[PDB]
Amino acid sequence: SMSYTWTGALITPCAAEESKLPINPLSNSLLRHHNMVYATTSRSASLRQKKVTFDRLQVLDDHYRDVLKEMKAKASTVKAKLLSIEEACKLTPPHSAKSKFGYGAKDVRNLSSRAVNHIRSVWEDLLEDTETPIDTTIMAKSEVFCVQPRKPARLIVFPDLGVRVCEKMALYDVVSTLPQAVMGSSYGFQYSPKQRVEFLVNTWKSKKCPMGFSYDTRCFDSTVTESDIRVEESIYQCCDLAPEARQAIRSLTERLYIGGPLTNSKGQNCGYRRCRASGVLTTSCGNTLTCYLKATAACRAAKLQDCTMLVNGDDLVVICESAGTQEDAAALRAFTEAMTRYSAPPGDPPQPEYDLELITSCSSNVSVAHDASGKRVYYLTRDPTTPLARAAWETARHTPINSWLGNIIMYAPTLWARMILMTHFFSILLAQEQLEKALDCQIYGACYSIEPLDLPQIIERLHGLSAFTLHSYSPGEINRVASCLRKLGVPPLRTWRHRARSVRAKLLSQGGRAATCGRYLFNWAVRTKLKLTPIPAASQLDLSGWFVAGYSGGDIYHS
Ligand SMILES: Cc1ccc(S(=O)(=O)Nc2ccc(Oc3ccccc3)cc2C(=O)O)cc1
Known part of the structure; x- marks a missing residue:
């Protein structure tokens, strides 16, 4: 029919x-x-x-x-x-x-x-x-x-x-x-x-x-x-x-x-x-x-x-x-x-x-990068075109769901989410003085309320500490990210590195969780790396219910 x-x-x-x-x-x-x-x-x-x-x-x-x-x-x-x-x-x-x-x-x-x-x-x-x-x-x-x-x-x-x-x-x-x-x-x-x-x-x-x-x-x-x-x-x-x-x-x-x-x-x-x-x-x-x-x-x-x-x-x-x-x-x-x-x-x-x-x-693919020790580590990535377009829209208008927060959480290890999304949004949340404010995002369709300040723990638990030390990404991944930046008119690595080092300094001076965001999220931006040890609070996270089932279109909110 x-x-x-x-x-x-x-x-x-x-x-x-x-x-x-x-x-x-x-x-x-x-x-x-x-x-x-x-x-x-x-x-x-x-x-x-x-x-x-x-x-x-x-x-x-x-x-x-x-x-x-x-x-x-x-x-x-x-x-x-x-x-x-x-x-x-x-x-x-x-x-x-x-x-x-x-x-x-x-x-x-x-x-x-x-x-x-x-x-x-x-x-x-x-x-x-x-x-x-x-x-x-x-x-x-x-x-x-x-x-x-x-x-x-x-x-x-x-x-x-x-x-x-x-x-x-x-x-x-x-x-x-x-x-x-x-x-x-x-x-x-x-x-x-x-x-x-x-x-x-x-x-x-x-x-x-x-x-x-x-x-x-x-x-x-x-x-x-x-x-x-x-x-x-x-x-x-x-x-x-x-x-x-x-x-x-x-x-x-x-x-x-x-x-x-x-x-x-x-x-x-x-x-x-x-x-x-x-x-x-x-x-x-x-x-x-x-x-x-x-x-x-x-x-x-x-x-x-x-x-x-x-x-x-x-x-x-x-x-x-x-x-x-x-x-x-x-x-x-x-x-x-x-x-x-x-x-x-x-x-x-x-x-x-x-x-x-x-x-x-699922609009994504497996790729390889390396941690501080030089060991190959696999992670999930995707073309960043849409994520970035949406990050830009969500920066200009107020949206119920924050796809950018969802994208940082799910793609924390990626070269683009670290260099671009983290830097861009933390610099803005810092200025507006809104680092403490919990925001909603979706994971497999279900809505969640997350505080930006907990991202380090969230990322360590979900991706492991190597998410904060990956480098030497694949030539294919680098070419895809680069052509994306040229297409959308997105600033080059050097500009993001400079902004990151600045955001990182502001976060450290604040102490508490903010400083924790500075140390881990932005270690890629400094030369004098900091020893990144297991985050206590990451061993106390109950993120199980995050990956149980799909709910897209299901009108589901998990408090
Ligand atoms: C999170 C992140 C991690 C490591 C770096 S790095 O500066 O230590 N190394 C690189 C610097 C440039 C680059 O290639 C790019 C080309 C265009 C845009 C972005 C990167 C790739 C890498 C790498 O480690 O593979 C930058 C950003």
């Missing part, structure tokens, strides 16, 4: 939309070619709609069914608990879109009488009505990018706040535990960046002659069929569930997950959806399961040997045993045709890779 149906009503904004980077004294010191930075707006909504609207084709075979049974078997070991209204409310972000029933996020987090009572009626409704399609709002997402040698806005579909709270009650535990139970080491969200690298590298080393490839599905959400979603539910149903949870999952599946009506910001019937909605709790878990299911089955059909999958939502990377150049290319092609039959056609044609550093997955 058609992934979408359109009435003709337009996808409308809910207020003025900013598309250009404001000329700002601070963002200008980070990146000079401000005209290359833009934010998508609903003005490109029509371009996106045309791309995600099409009739899906799906043909299932014995491999698909075999893998599904294997998956259901593992799901059978799980026991999901069901959250109380109180617990679900606590998971709601303070900035989550308000309900249309007289209350907002704050009321939800504060267990307000009106919010709680409405949520209860919505839950009871899920238990009683098993068919009425649940209403959803559709909006053009506002994201920042750098022009290319432009990207139309993505579309986000989400239900009301009341319904979102109910989703948590019925499925939060499910989506946080089942993927790992079912997919094991292949579930990407269980790994911190360091752990992901370790998994990728160890997997690559376990092969006689390794071959790997990333698979980009063309607009994955729209390729998800009604069948995929019911298959997905069938997996969840293998869990031991409370009666009410079981019914809520059944109702939520038929009333919301498989599709439903689309309403714009003005309250106008925009159309109908028959594919994956981006803004629901099950989106990450659902896409991961579906991608893993089709890919694992496709690998068998294609006869790829000893495959090892790493899946993060719709992002997939496969590493297998090479059977030779011609054969690998033929097997990959067979893989793609199998995936196409499963309704997961490729966007970018896949290509076999024999060099791990050249494989991009």
Whole structure:
């Protein structure tokens, strides 16, 4: 059937939309070619709609069914608990879109009488009505990018706040535990960046002659069929569930997950959806399961040997045993045709890779640098173009989420996050006298509140002390970073080094945690290095819950 149906009503904004980077004294010191930075707006909504609207084709075979049974078997070991209204409310972000029933996020987090009572009626409704399609709002997402040698806005579909709270009650535990139970080491969200690298590298080393490839599905959400979603539910149903949870999952599946009506910001019937909605709790878990299911089955059909999958939502990377150049290319092609039959056609044609550093997955790749002792150390990196464009936008405007903080945390070892993001933002936080102020950022979609001053401990725990001493980066990584700086008009190393030494001195003179930020975060900027010993507070950090599951679009806040 058609992934979408359109009435003709337009996808409308809910207020003025900013598309250009404001000329700002601070963002200008980070990146000079401000005209290359833009934010998508609903003005490109029509371009996106045309791309995600099409009739899906799906043909299932014995491999698909075999893998599904294997998956259901593992799901059978799980026991999901069901959250109380109180617990679900606590998971709601303070900035989550308000309900249309007289209350907002704050009321939800504060267990307000009106919010709680409405949520209860919505839950009871899920238990009683098993068919009425649940209403959803559709909006053009506002994201920042750098022009290319432009990207139309993505579309986000989400239900009301009341319904979102109910989703948590019925499925939060499910989506946080089942993927790992079912997919094991292949579930990407269980790994911190360091752990992901370790998994990728160890997997690559376990092969006689390794071959790997990333698979980009063309607009994955729209390729998800009604069948995929019911298959997905069938997996969840293998869990031991409370009666009410079981019914809520059944109702939520038929009333919301498989599709439903689309309403714009003005309250106008925009159309109908028959594919994956981006803004629901099950989106990450659902896409991961579906991608893993089709890919694992496709690998068998294609006869790829000893495959090892790493899946993060719709992002997939496969590493297998090479059977030779011609054969690998033929097997990959067979893989793609199998995936196409499963309704997961490729966007970018896949290509076999024999060099791990050249494989991009989750917009990132593994690369090598060296610590003070000279030992090779692997770490996760990526082209810094988008991260920098966003750092610049976030420096000029006030944004709910601070992608820059998230990028420093996740890419602490990289040459660009250290030289640029750390230097730029600490210099600004110092001046504005806001080093103590906790800021929100996202990690695998979930929102977190983090104080800049704890970055040293955070980085040591997550990446190890070598994150503060890496040097001699790969020629490929250096060329990529350099060409990026020239493109965006970003100051050269010498300028950043000078600014870093200055920021570093100001931090040291302050003592306390600030000085700790000076010593570790900026040791790369001075010649007379300082002995960097284990940070006490790093051995007392509970960062486990950071890498458990994916929640993009799930409206999840972890306090
Ligand atoms: C965090 C960081 C770590 C080490 C340094 S360094 O000055 O000690 N060494 C380098 C200096 C320049 C360079 O190549 C670049 C070219 C353009 C832009 C940035 C770096 C690469 C390296 C390195 O250690 O590999 C600078 C920044």
